[PDB]
Amino acid sequence: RTYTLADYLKNTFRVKSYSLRWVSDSEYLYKQENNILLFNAEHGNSSIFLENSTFEIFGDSISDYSVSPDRLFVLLEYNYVKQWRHSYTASYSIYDLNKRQLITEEKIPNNTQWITWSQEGHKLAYVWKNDIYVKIEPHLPSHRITSTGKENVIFNGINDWVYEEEIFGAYSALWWSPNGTFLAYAQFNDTGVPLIEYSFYSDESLQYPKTVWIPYPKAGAVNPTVKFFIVNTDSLSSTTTTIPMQITAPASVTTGDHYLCDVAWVSEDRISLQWLRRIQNYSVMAICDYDKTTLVWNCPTTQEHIETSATGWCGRFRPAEPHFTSDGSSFYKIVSDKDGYKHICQFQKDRKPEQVCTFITKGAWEVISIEALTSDYLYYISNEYKEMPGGRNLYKIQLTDHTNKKCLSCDLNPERCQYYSVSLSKEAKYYQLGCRGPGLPLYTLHRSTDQKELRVLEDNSALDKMLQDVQMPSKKLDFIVLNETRFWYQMILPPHFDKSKKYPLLIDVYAGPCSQKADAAFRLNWATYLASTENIIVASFDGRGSGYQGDKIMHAINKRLGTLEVEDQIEAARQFLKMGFVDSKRVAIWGWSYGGYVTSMVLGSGSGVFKCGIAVAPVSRWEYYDSVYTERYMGLPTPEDNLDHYRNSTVMSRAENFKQVEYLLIHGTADDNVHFQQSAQISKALVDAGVDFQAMWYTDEDHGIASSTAHQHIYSHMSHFLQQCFSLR
């Protein structure tokens, strides 16, 4: 038998992982049959922390939990209600560990939008109806911080739509101080922001459909305004009025519209604020100190760190995090060097006439993330090993002597593991390696000094079984040389792939700015089924615009968001035809989200290479998508800037060319990210041009189309289309 569509949809063969929460420097928490257990890495033993009977107290309504830093209180999340990608609503209740009972006095209210423990100690802050609250002791009344909150207008301590999605990648917009004296938070005003309005039909019992509306700044429209504040939590009393204090400036960014795009506490009276203009080629990192004699946070021009880019935009999607040292003088930051390569370089708290930073890495590769920073060493991930951009390995570097650069996960299992993700302890004396691919995922615990594997946490032995009678596909990671430079690709080849024979080709495409589809990770997804059962080669290609390969490749599509990554996906297909194992008459392409836009543009190009293709929730033109993301790569839709390419990079302009192909357009009606409008315009243009196509809407489904039945329906519907396109059924 083969890896059938049913096996993917019903999820019979489950790829396991090992989630753990580092509580101490040598202790973590892990789940087992709904019983959270405490593990001490000092020895090889485990102690019972909190039983399944405790979570059972609320039934199956427990969605998540969160233990306090002092290990005396547990935050029990329940009645989970999703909103957008990261935002959600839930009820809460605190569990005491010593007394072993619930705290039923001064409770957390219903529909709490966010909660957080402090960095150190059992302090609680939370957002409710767009207003921030502080709770010093779980049993004591909460002190109200803000009273300006209003639904979809004024947000206190939480992000609106665009900030949640494109900036922080999270709903929370508040940050506790290290010891717990202060509580920083951002405030957003959506008064000028226009509303997207779509219909929600709900269950069939609902007679009249509800009109959902969201403050949504489309490209060129009025954005939200931001305001940063800090409130002293140690001075909160019901006798005196709680008065937060606002950090103004920088003067350079406040010339026009701007964004708050990161914040990190350095010390108890020092904090770094990352800012960014609407034209996202100018970022300022202002470090500010608390003047306790006048109760105002001072932000001098000497402690500012400017970051700019002539070729495109700052960072990959945003200016990276600064990792400060314990004392709070030096901070490390992933920045593009003179050759155009993302590398770690050291800054001090004071700036320099021309802020040159000492790059601790110089090679022709990029640093992915800074995982930890100790007193004498630094942990980071890079794509250096075997010169593969799609690879991930853990590296260790010394601050004093930069030449000491040891790899931690390179040769642990070089065949099975070429893609790692790490979860370090507090001071990084123990760590967990997360082997993702290309073999069966493997998870192991380690000691920092000896690099010695303590044990095997999860090796997918159950997944090793079950797949004993299945025709497993094989992943092939490789590259080609185009125009004096490498371009890596991926291929999920059918089982027992024969080079002499010809197969149907499907181009799996996303190809967004700083995207990477060609990697060494293992996945049991829809592509696995198409190779295992239908004998279809599912390929992927990272052309010009893709990331982790320098800023020459990534910024090639600056102000040109639908041209090079369109043509490079066509060229990639032509190169696969030359290899001699692809049927030229049965070549297709499919993509979700940005991939839908690329798919649609590829089909609209009229190259003659692709027979059919499927666009799922595609962007149609860039004026319809949000401002932050769109204006990062494109300009503003004005004659003064870049309106001409806005008008030329639309899908519906190329509607006449769809007569040469078979097109399947899919889109969820309640999509808050890429609105149903976009496909609605595409389809209307195809109708006017007199070109026949296939369509499918999904009632009340959002961008993910992640409802169980809707997920089963779309991938089953797409399979029928692909069988009919290649003449299989």
Partner: antibody, heavy 117, light 107 residues
């Protein structure tokens, strides 16, 4: 095999309080949890609260927070519910049930409790 | 919390016939449970996880569903099956009950 048994029927005057037990035997009493219910003579059921015999941790319904109080004796393997300050509205049948971290898989005999002058 | 609505109060069907049973929620439910109660007796556990049988429940009883409309089917109703049924929810705390599904028999 697993048996649950409560005290007999009861009568009390308005303003008074009552207590009714739920003795259990067979399974390891400390492992599984105890939940209590309420049902009027001709109405639907109503959830009151829940206890874990091991630590004696309680969690009540908001509707019965300032009325019912739950306790347990793990040596005798007997759970209790303590109804404070009754009225004519409290006249109903009460049940004690066990939870298998899934649903109410074990049930007691059931006990009618009347409140009248 | 979640107001479950049983459909309808009393329902009759002859011995050996099909009998379907549904519990309509207001918000949403991940996993619906069911309970049988004979008059003047304690409720008994019937179907947990919507489909799976309890320790002692016969094989003719089985259910399914999702969202705000779950179900429970009874293959060939017997004389002993004449008893009131209730649907239970606990995907959201506090847990709630139905109202009345009195399984009548047509003789």
């Amino acid at each position: 095999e697993f048996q649950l048994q409560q005290s007999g029927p009861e009568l009390v005057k308005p303003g008074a309080s009552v207590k009714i037990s739920c003795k259990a035997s067979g399974y390891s009493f400390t492992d599984y949890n105890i939940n209590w219910m309420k049902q009027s003579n001709g109405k639907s059921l109503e959830w009151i609260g829940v206890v874990i015999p091991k630590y004696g941790t309680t969690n009540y319904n908001q509707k019965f927070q300032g009325k019912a109080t739950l306790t347990v004796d793990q040596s005798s393997s007997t759970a209790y519910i303590q109804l404070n300050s009754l009225t004519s509205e409290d006249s109903a049948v009460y049940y004690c049930t066990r939870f298998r971290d899934v649903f109410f898989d074990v049930w007691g005999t059931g006990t009618t409790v009347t409140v009248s002058s | 919390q979640i107001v479950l609505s049983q459909s309808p109060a009393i329902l009759s069907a002859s011995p050996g016939e099909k009998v379907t049973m549904t519990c309509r929620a207001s918000s949403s439910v991940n996993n619906m449970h069911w309970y049988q109660q004979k008059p003047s007796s304690s409720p008994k556990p019937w179907l947990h996880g919507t489909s799976n049988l309890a320790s002692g429940v016969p094989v003719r009883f089985s259910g399914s569903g999702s969202g705000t409309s779950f179900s429970l089917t009874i293959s060939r109703v017997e004389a002993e099956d004449a008893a009131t049924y209730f649907c239970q929810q606990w995907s959201n705390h506090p847990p709630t009950f139905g109202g009345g599904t009195k399984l009548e028999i047509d003789r």
